Amino acid sequence: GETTDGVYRVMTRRLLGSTQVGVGVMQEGVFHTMWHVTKGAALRSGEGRLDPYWGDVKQDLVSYCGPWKLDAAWDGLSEVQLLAVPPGERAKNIQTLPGIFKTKDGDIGAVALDYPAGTSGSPILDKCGRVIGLYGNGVVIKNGSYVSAITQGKR
Amino acid sequence: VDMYIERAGDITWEKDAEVTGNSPRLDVALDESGDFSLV
């Protein structure tokens, strides 16, 4: 009920209105987002509370209610879609051919798409609609342009 | 702070998707803080 599959905004509020700090994915009863979005704070979902279950600052990932479930991988060849959920805007799909981050721990697909801070955690999809990673941990090249890793956890 | 979630959509690939962005090959390092940088 409070964990139905889908993409969700992560919001904060106090005694006034709400601000979107990120996005995440509900799959198999587990909520998935980036560590920098929530810092491991508990999340309200309707009348219920979701508590962090697993997370890792270096990977910049966190899961709630259970272990990380998303395991689809970019195939290194195909176009992908960012299902961007920008603050104040409807969810939208943006198709792109990833580049790569070449790292000492392997190649990571990387999308040269620039969306605001609160879009962090938006899912990146393969052609079957599976989530191959989350958007929003990236680099900035010399001219200022942004490139995000396709950040995926381990199931 | 009330941090909460609200539905934004169903997770699907959209065949009518705008295609954009380049495809860079970048040498990158990841530090223990979770920050990527260019090598």
Binding site: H36, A117, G136, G138, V139, V140, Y146 | -
Partner: peptide, 6 residues
């Protein structure tokens, strides 16, 4: 980006 690279 825009909280830096996040």
């Amino acid at each position: 980006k825009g909280x830096x690279k996040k």
